[PDB]
Every structure is written in C-alpha cells, then in structure tokens.
Design an enzyme around this catalytic site. Structure first.
Site, PDB file in Angstrom:
ATOM      1  N   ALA A  72       0.841  -1.195   0.000  1.00 50.77           N
ATOM      2  CA  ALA A  72       0.000   0.000   0.000  1.00 50.77           C
ATOM      3  C   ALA A  72       0.880   1.252   0.000  1.00 50.77           C
ATOM      4  O   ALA A  72       2.075   1.169   0.290  1.00 50.77           O
ATOM      5  CB  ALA A  72      -0.902  -0.005   1.220  1.00 50.77           C
ATOM      6  N   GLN A  74       1.052   3.493   2.150  1.00 45.68           N
ATOM      7  CA  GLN A  74       1.592   3.653   3.497  1.00 45.68           C
ATOM      8  C   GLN A  74       2.278   2.401   4.049  1.00 45.68           C
ATOM      9  O   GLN A  74       2.381   2.233   5.264  1.00 45.68           O
ATOM     10  CB  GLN A  74       0.494   4.135   4.451  1.00 45.68           C
ATOM     11  CG  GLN A  74       0.155   5.611   4.300  1.00 45.68           C
ATOM     12  CD  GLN A  74       1.372   6.509   4.441  1.00 45.68           C
ATOM     13  OE1 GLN A  74       2.207   6.310   5.328  1.00 45.68           O
ATOM     14  NE2 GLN A  74       1.469   7.516   3.575  1.00 45.68           N
ATOM     15  N   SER A  75       2.756   1.536   3.156  1.00 46.98           N
ATOM     16  CA  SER A  75       3.457   0.311   3.552  1.00 46.98           C
ATOM     17  C   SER A  75       4.679   0.591   4.432  1.00 46.98           C
ATOM     18  O   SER A  75       5.532   1.410   4.078  1.00 46.98           O
ATOM     19  CB  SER A  75       3.893  -0.485   2.316  1.00 46.98           C
ATOM     20  OG  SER A  75       4.721  -1.590   2.667  1.00 46.98           O
ATOM     21  N   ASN A  76       4.749  -0.086   5.576  1.00 45.46           N
ATOM     22  CA  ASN A  76       5.959  -0.083   6.397  1.00 45.46           C
ATOM     23  C   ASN A  76       7.079  -0.876   5.713  1.00 45.46           C
ATOM     24  O   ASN A  76       8.251  -0.490   5.766  1.00 45.46           O
ATOM     25  CB  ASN A  76       5.682  -0.669   7.789  1.00 45.46           C
ATOM     26  CG  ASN A  76       4.632   0.115   8.563  1.00 45.46           C
ATOM     27  OD1 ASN A  76       4.809   1.298   8.859  1.00 45.46           O
ATOM     28  ND2 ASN A  76       3.537  -0.554   8.915  1.00 45.46           N
ATOM     29  N   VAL A  78       7.682  -1.389   2.463  1.00 44.84           N
ATOM     30  CA  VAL A  78       8.298  -0.667   1.353  1.00 44.84           C
ATOM     31  C   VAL A  78       9.265   0.396   1.875  1.00 44.84           C
ATOM     32  O   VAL A  78      10.351   0.582   1.324  1.00 44.84           O
ATOM     33  CB  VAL A  78       7.246  -0.044   0.411  1.00 44.84           C
ATOM     34  CG1 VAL A  78       7.902   0.877  -0.609  1.00 44.84           C
ATOM     35  CG2 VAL A  78       6.459  -1.135  -0.306  1.00 44.84           C
TER      36      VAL A  78
END
Lengths: 321, 328
Positions: A72, A74-76, A78
C-alpha cells in the site's frame, strides 16, 4: 540450528527489548509484556527489518543492484526496503496501490510515503495489487530488460526465507522470558508463521494468537500454514502446532482505522508511552484486550504482545482517511 | 576514573544498552573523509532522541522529591516536550506543556501533526502562549497555578538543559570513548547546539576522556556571540557538580541556521536528502539537518582543526519531518 546456514546481513544487532507493562497490566488486571520489535535502528524501525536481513543477503549473493517490492502507499515494508536499499547503494522500485480509495493529502504524501521520496524510491502506481507475485515479476522483467539486475521481494517480505527473521525473534523471546500467550498482528503472514515454528520448538506450552488485519480466518489460515510448513521444511524441523487466528478486529478492512484499534493506540500511549499504529498493532492490541474481556485465551496467565512497529503511519492517517 | 562522581546522581533507565556508533561508508565516500554517527535517535521511548538522556537524570530527581507532575516548555514541534510527555505517561506522572509557535506558521501539519499529534496521545495538558519571552518565569507562574490544583509539579527547563540534565551527555561521552577505543581515532565530533545541554555535557565528558578530539557545535537558533556564553555556563556548572575543572574552549559555528530557529533552509534540506539517499538515515529540518549541513561545509572549507575521522551526534528529531511536510 540450520538457521545459521542462511546468509544474512546485520541490520538490528542486539536483541530488541522485551518489557513488562506495569500500568497497562494494572489497568487490564492481567500481566502484559511487550516485544519491542518497533525499536530497530533503520528508518523508524519495525518487523520487516528482521525479514530483510535474510532477503537482502540473498539479493547480494545473487548480485542484484535493484530491490523491487510492493505494498500500500503507506506500507511499512516498502519504507524499510527503500531505506535498506539506500544504505547499501541499491536501487529501489516500489509497486504501490491505494487500498482504501482515499484522496486525503497525508495518506497520499505524508508518513511512510514521504520517507520513500527521501530514500529516492522509484514509484510505480497500480490500480490494485490483484496478483502481487505476478505483477512484481512482470515489473522485474521490464527492469531486467531495461539493463538492471533486480531482486524481487514479495509483499510484506513474507517468503519462507524472509520469515526466518521471525524464527530469530522467537529465539530472543525464549531467551528473554526465562507466559501463557503471545499476540501478533497477522497480515502477509511471515511474522506469524516464523513465530509459530520458533515458538513450537522453544516454548510449546505457549498459545500463539494471530489477530488478522486484512482477512477472515478461512482466508488467512491456509496462508500461515503454508508458510509454517515451508519454514519448517527449510530448517529440517517438524511443525504440527495448530494455527490460531482471530478475525474480529480489522473491520471494515485492511488499512482502515477502527474505533477499538484507535482506542488501543490511545491506551498504550497514555499508560505506557508506547506508540502503536492504526493499521496493524492497534488492531492486534484491540484483539488482545477483547481476548481478556471475552476470556478467549486458552488460559488467563501472562500475555506477550509483539510490537511489530508501524508508528510512522500515525502521521499519514491524521487527521482522517 | 575522572567521571566517577557521575555515579552519585540517581537516574532512571530509559535507554538500557549503549546506542549504536556506526560508520557511514557511502556518506564517507561522497565527502572524502571518514564519517561515523552516534545513533542517539535510536532509543526505545516514543521515537527517541537526545532529550531522553537528560530525562533519565531530571525525572529521577523529580521522583526523589515526590513530584507527580512534570512541567516544561518548547515549540509546538518540540522533541523535548514529546519525550517528556512520553516519559510522564510511562511513569504515571501528569504532564503540562507550555507551547509557542516560534515561526508564526498556520500550516496544519505544523499545528497538529508530528510531535504535536503525539502530545495528545500521551494526554499532555497543553498550555499555549504567544511567545516564550522568559521561559523560567513563565514555567514558574504555570507551576504555581498547577500546584494550586493539588499537583506536585517539577519544572523542567527548555530542552531539559540544566547542569543535571546535561549529565546525560557526560554519560554519552563515556559510551563514545569506550566505543571508539581500539576501533577509531576520532579527530572531530559534531553536534547541534540548541538549548546547550547536549553540547555542554559532551564538552565536559570529551575534555576528560578524549582531550585531543575537537568538539564542534552547530548553532540552530543563535549566533556564536549569543550561544557561546550559554554553553560555557553549563560546561562550568557541569564540571563543578562533578568536582572537575573544564578548561577547553567551546567551539561553535553559526553559519547554518538562518533564517532562524525552526525555519528550514536549503543546505539543511539537502543534508536531509543526502543522509536519506546515501545511508537510509533520517535527519530533521530543525536540528540534525542543519548540524549535518555544518559538518559537510566544515569539510568543504577545511574548518576542522585536523582532517581525520568525524563523529556526528544524531540527536534525533525525525518526527518533525511529518510536521514540516509539505511546507510551513
């Protein structure tokens, strides 16, 4: 034992703290401990870093110059991959979706997403991650044909190799606890599965509960099991333990805050000075708390909450959507 | 041996293990010099920072005298206030924060996001003021009103920078000395110099453990003329409390903070982008970004006494990144 046969980079070093939470414990009337995997030295930290130790070591062995992953906006995961890539002089290509149909400025441009820009991540937007493994492979082939050497990291870093990071956390847990229950958010499933294999062998009396953050028990259980077996197979261990999942705490869906979850955030902040997050750990803690209310755990002894991180997302979710 | 009276001060355990001291190979390759980083941004409490080191001593002092409330001041985006509030929550102490808007911004993310968001999560009592014209007097006035309600307040000065607070950075110097021992011969140390406790604590510690190392503070709010006497006073007060002399000259560079405290500048933002893209390290626009810009330019102009390895003290500040985005 065979864990040390796997190449890995050192990103964390010392074992993360395992702490008693006296104020939360007093309030809930139950002994609660926390595994602080939110405290890791790389780019505001989190659980994905444990996975990346193995995944990025594999990348370097394969001679990659580029890391490619998806998540997403807001991926942690990534964000942590992008930071690790920058640190090692590797390119990074992120395949991103907006999973909640928001146009809120902070979700779109602040929090984890802001950090991606700082880390010089090359951003690829897609309408939906309908088939991530497939979409990542397509992207990797383009980039490989473009003249690079990509290494594909799957969604949330959840492969059997990545999940070794959480077999590792289990060793720290076992060492530090020398407990009736352990609670962890169950998303892409690598963290849950790795902890399952480790805890089965290290602490067999302990009940491991995954609180789902994106799926029903029916949808999630086969994923965790598949990872559990693959991990055990690669370590030459047997894994027979039941996978326990609670799916009551994530509605209306992945990456959308709910009241119970945001109230879990407020509780931990005000009682312990600990920062959870709206997508993952808040929901998991909401589950923990309800498990107390509903007497849902196998028995009523000490609970260990696994803090998998996620806090930078607080700034993207504020003020709403 | 010489820092033994440090044992005498009661202190709480907020950090635990010594924070990492890391080589920065990609930054070093770019700058043409060995750069190391002291990771004080990596502490276990509410996104970390240098202020936590001071709070270990300040809050221990508060508890010893039976206080149940901590009162302190800062900007809306103060890292100190956020760390004080987090510690208060953890210990079940009440917290009252006197805040100002130092830059006159109306930007919503500055007003409500970042550190300021976290303050609400820690149930901090917020008390706004037009400006911190006289923080010691303003804090004392507020403490009188708080005490009338039956609370037992403990006043923590701006930035946690008293001689007692600064003992946290005397301790940090001990870590640094042990961590460099037989691993690296440092020539220089760079730290942001704000309310001055960190700089002063390091100045005393490093004078006694690593006398040949040149300590440089990059000012983030004042000129050398304004900042230098503040650091010296603390340095002398810290030394006195430890039964030591401190004869070292304080070094400050004030070329890197304009247009003023809390206002981002180009060199600062370029430093933030550089550390992020080269090392996966997050600096901030108010403090560490400007300090790093100082370090970089210090190399460029050969401002350091000797061109050997430099240690950058990462004092934290990253949550402000989210408050300063997209602009103020």
């Amino acid at each position: 034992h065979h864990l040390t046969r796997f190449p890995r980079l050192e990103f964390i070093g010392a074992p993360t703290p395992l702490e008693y939470l006296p104020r939360l414990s007093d309030y809930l009337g139950r002994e609660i401990y926390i595994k602080r995997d939110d405290v890791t030295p790389i780019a505001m930290g989190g659980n994905k870093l444990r996975k990346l130790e193995f995944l990025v070591a594999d990348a370097l062995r394969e001679g990659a110059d580029t890391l490619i992953t998806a998540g997403a906006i807001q991926s942690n995961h990534v964000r942590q991959t992008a930071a690790v890539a920058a640190k090692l002089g590797l390119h990074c290509v992120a395949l991103l979706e907006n999973p909640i149909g928001t146009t809120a400025e902070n979700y779109l441009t602040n929090g984890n997403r802001l950090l991606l820009d700082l880390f010089n991540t090359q951003i690829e937007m897609c309408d939906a991650l309908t088939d991530p493994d497939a979409q990542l492979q397509t992207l990797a082939t383009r980039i490989e044909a473009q003249g690079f050497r990509p290494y594909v990291i799957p969604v949330g870093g959840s492969s059997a190799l990545g999940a070794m990071g959480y077999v590792e956390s289990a060793l720290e847990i076992a060492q530090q606890c020398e407990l009736s229950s352990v609670v962890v958010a169950s998303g892409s499933a690598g963290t849950h599965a790795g902890l399952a294999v480790g805890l089965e062998h290290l602490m067999p009396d302990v009940e491991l509960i995954g609180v789902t953050v994106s799926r029903s028990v029916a949808e999630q259980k086969p994923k965790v099991i598949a990872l559990q077996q693959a991990i055990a197979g690669q370590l030459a261990l047997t894994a027979t333990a039941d996978i326990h999942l609670w799916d009551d705490y994530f509605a209306p869906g992945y990456g959308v805050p709910n009241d119970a979850g945001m109230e879990a955030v407020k509780l931990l902040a005000s009682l312990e000075g600990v920062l959870l997050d709206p997508v993952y750990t808040g929901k998991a803690m909401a589950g923990l708390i309800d498990g107390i209310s509903q007497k849902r755990f196998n028995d009523d002894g000490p609970i260990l909450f696994i803090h998998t991180g996620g806090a930078p997302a607080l700034f993207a979710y504020h003020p709403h959507v």
